[PDB]
Write a structure and sequence with these properties.
Blueprint: E1 23-25, E2 31-32, E3 37-40, E4 52-55, E5 65-74, E6 78-85, E7 97-102, E8 107-114, E9 128-132, E10 140-149
Antiparallel strand pairs: 1-4, 2-3, 3-10, 4-9, 5-8, 5-10, 6-7, 6-9
């Protein structure tokens, strides 16, 4: 993992029993089976802005680099899309990407990016993070945990 004891920034990381205060819709009613939640994304929607998870709370200090450690795998294999930033106002985000490769590899993936825009929790623009997996080429996404850290020494 990161440095001694990851630096969980948000007090929540257990999608095995409940999806905490996170959101989820657009795909198949997710289901936390044994200890993980999966969503059927085989349909065929050529537009990620359709199914995915969502949640606020993800401060960003323009200048430093953050990291997202999501626990999940793609079945079959294929790339997905993820975005993170504020939720109102500038709207422009820095965690806006669409090249996230995922296959039968279950584990925590760490995505490190450079903060280019400060994003505080107060200002009609709190934390924002929407996992975009919807895709005419999508498939199935099984997640059991999700949390972002920073790792400092």
């Amino acid at each position: 993992a990161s440095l001694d004891s990851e630096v969980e920034l948000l007090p929540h990381t257990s999608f095995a029993e409940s999806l905490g205060p996170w959101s989820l819709y657009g795909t198949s009613e997710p289901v936390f089976a044994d200890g993980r939640m999966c969503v059927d994304l085989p349909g065929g929607q050529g537009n990620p802005w359709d199914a995915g998870l969502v949640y606020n709370g993800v401060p960003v200090g323009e200048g430093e680099s953050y990291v997202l450690s999501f626990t999940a795998s793609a079945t079959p294999d294929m790339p997905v899309r993820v975005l993170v930033g504020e939720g109102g106002g500038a709207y422009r985000t820095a965690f806006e990407q669409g090249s996230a490769p995922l296959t039968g590899e279950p584990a925590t993936r760490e995505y490190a990016f450079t903060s280019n825009l400060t994003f505080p929790p107060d200002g009609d623009a709190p934390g924002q993070v929407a996992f975009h997996l919807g895709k005419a080429g999508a498939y199935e996404f099984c997640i059991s945990q999700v949390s972002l850290t920073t790792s400092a020494t």
